């Protein structure tokens, strides 16, 4: 009865009497969120909220508005969670309906990064991220980390086919020199833009005042320059002249990130009654996304925030977001040895699970590119990888040897990087976070499966569920099939990195926020510069030299593997 | 006797006792400049300076130092000018000597922008720019304009072969993902760097403290962020707390540019005794170049600033320099009608001079790519173009018709842009500046030859002189052969732009500074944003719409032509 | 002035990349002297030339260029063209894209330089040796 009513609501099509809705417009979003809350205020049970929905839907509110609003409602609802009712799969959205048009593979349509379409169109990436923004102390820090992290992966995937590195959207008068054209099954609902499109300086003339608040270019540029110049001064100006918010190495990213996402309520709760100057720092991320949608508008109609990851320009935008990460990271370094675990790491290995293919070798894994599920709006391919595992040997260091009575408890952090992009903090891709508990003086070999990754979304392809993980799911995790960068046919060199940290002692918040909880900062140790390197005096120091020094930093081990590309028809 | 002694000095080779010299190191440059001045103080005639040279050269000062220093001396010397003795051609430098090695054209060496090598290695571009920095109120403004302008051309040339747009060096932790390897005849004297080289964070360990003052990365980044945040505030802080220098629409570029080039003496002369805070804004351009040379150093030895334009990374640097132009330009717009000439422009045409090739057409010109002169350190090709001309019709508007007794005197400004890059102020390439004087009420057709351009260096290929221009030469002009963007085999669309301005009344400084003198600002009207577009309210306005409106802005005409690529073996 | 070669995206089409191999000085001196030398004379001619074909095809595959299409049909096009290195273009030149054999004769080429051997005659020999 209830899940049926839900699928009913999500299936509702926008008609011509409906007040136009712009799911990428901050104002429209504020309205949407109010309708979300509006449902929650209708009772503590779902039937209460869902009634409010039919009620509003009959009063002819926009069906696309209701989907973003019913989605957020369903995701944060104690009743919904406990009854394990969720927002539907992305597949149930109306745009997954209308001859089945395929994609156009032509020498005229593969210019630029069009080849990375299989990645950007991938169904599980899109469902993941779709549910992600339904979920979303550390709200700025997560926004900034998550998006920086899927940038690092996209740049790496770019390098794998030897495509040029992505040029950040740092200059707002820049061209989108390639253009973008959705897969032919989506072109109906919305379209793209032509080569060398730009932001409109002031406004899109043909786009109604109802869909879009005029945010000229120079205003966004002001926010940008204002946030830039804060990060450097070290403070964010407050509504009150003499009480700025001072960036600390601990707060810096959560504030830069949050302000980028205009989560002032949340941040304001930590200022002791001061407020951040919203006129000064604005809402750069959401309005910036707003300008891209504006640019692609053609003559109002309804716009959804459906398929953001698909548009090549959102990845140029997320690269600009990352710039703020790069700026703040080197302003506030951290000691790499600061939270070392009294332990010694050795023999880091990334292996195939299936070792009975000799000639096989340690450190030689494999990805494959098979056919795209066109009915799931995928293009060009569907990436996957033969099942992998990593292991490392861990042996203790403590004065007091670990015993059943007094365990040493540490955390192992697994990152990888393309050998080429190795000396950049921000290209390292997080692959696992695993707790190890030692009870002997002796060494162990800790084994982690790919499917157990703390980073991975616990489902099979196309949202098919994992029995083993009925509880966790992490629907908004990084897809399993995209866990491994694609690699090259020759075997592309990558570097693996494990660090052992003493985190203790900690309390992960309640769903749906249990997942990114990390005592050290998300992405540690690569989220801030290393005071080893900033304060280096020789010149010889680098991430490379540090994570190869097993003598000086024994709680860090690195190893090199190779990822091999493959096609599977 | 004198020109022989000069060629003698310039031919001197660095030996192993010579104190190492770093022609890209600010400190070394300050030393060099002092040796320059040192010569000038030896007398008012050349023999006096040249004696001081042999004198110092015997005392074993560095021959490469003497070349930069004797070059600057020779260029600013009244005696030298009047005796028409000049610094030699770039050909006479020692690196133009050692089997003749060619270039390596291999599918492994054409990745990235390696194809634009014919342009960056071009001999006349290198001699031009080599002499340019020997020459160099408007010193900041010229530095910034000249370099922004050869960026615009390089980006356009990039687009012509459909290579990706150049990614600015805006993030200083960026990779040089392509690498660079000088033509094989230069690799001896100096070498390049490998794929994905970066700046050294702190210092190059293997590079002596004698060649390089340690300027870590974070220091440059500070200057950058400091200049960024000035441009936005509108002022440059002065040594004295309450008297900043306020940027005006008129001063803005000369100060941003000059401070980028650390020409504080010059700028300081306009502050009424205040000084700019050199600790705050630094010397970003010269040190930044210093960091690139540092990056490519391999183990001191001597480094010359020879062949800067060759290195693909200096064009990524000049793109970053341009960013400061982009920032300041839209902060201080100008009225496009502010200095209109009372006149009406019609029928703008770019033609081949040789119209007797029917089927020929107006607006269809032609470039060719012939063989590189390997003995002039060129690679891949030597661009050229069939002789072109432009003309426009000019008819007066004045209440008082122009008469032999009272001429209307206006200036015609010719710019072109790739149709794709048209709506960006900074991609328009200046092609001519010509004075027109009217004596009738009637229309005229003003004709300008390519070889007469106010932008062009008045020589044939390889520094061969123009009889017609014995006087002017403009040795540091834009080469003739590179005047036209290369185009495409299909005929690449370009747009031509003519504006008529009333400049009167003006006084070009003395050589060698006569050339960039312009009452309107160099690059007008594209050097600052147009207040037509910044203050637009419709959204429909663009450079395109404005320069097509012959009714509303009749002193502006535009037309479209096509440039055709060609090979000549 | 020493003219170099033109490395341009317009001049690297086809097998133009194998130019370092075909222009190589020691290959050219070798083969130049070879035909000054030349029981087994047929067998050597055929083997030597088959063998430097095998190497050229392999070298072709190494840069992943297409395999060479034999001149087995005499009405075939030379779809790429050829332009000698710029230091040789003076003495002799090449031909443009899609040049063919002249069916009968080159009209502009003197009877002193060339005995008219029309195409169909060569084709006859070919078909005769085949059979
Ligand atoms: Zn997102
Ligand atoms: Zn320069
Ligand atoms: Zn032979």
Author numbering:
A (entry chain A), B (entry chain A): 42 to 139, 146 to 183, 198 to 360, 369 to 575, 577 to 639
C (entry chain A): 146 to 183, 198 to 290
Q: How is this structure described in the published paper?
A:
Our experimental results clearly indicate that the hemocyanin-like protein AsqI is the cyclopenase, which is the enzyme in the viridicatin biosynthetic pathway that has eluded isolation for nearly four decades. In this reaction, the active-site zinc ion acts as a Lewis acid catalyst to activate the substrate epoxide and facilitate essentially an anti-Baldwin-type epoxide-opening 6-endo-tet cyclization.
Based on the structure and the sequence homology of AsqI to hemocyanin, residues His176, His180, and His208 were identified to form the metal-binding site A in AsqI. However, the second tri-histidine metal-binding site B found in hemocyanins was formed by His346, Leu350, and Y387 in AsqI and no metal ion was observed there. Supplementing the reaction mixture with 30 µM ZnCl2 doubled kcat to 16.0 ± 0.30 min–1 but had a little effect on Km, which was 0.066 ± 0.0052 mM, indicating the important catalytic role the metal ion plays. To account for the role of zinc and the enzyme in the reaction of 5, we also optimized the structure of 5 in complex with Zn2+ and two imidazole molecules, which model the two histidine side chain groups identified experimentally as the metal ligands. The structure shows that the metal ion is coordinated to the imidazole molecules and the epoxide and C2 amide oxygen atoms of the substrate in a tetrahedral arrangement as frequently observed in zinc-complexed protein structures.
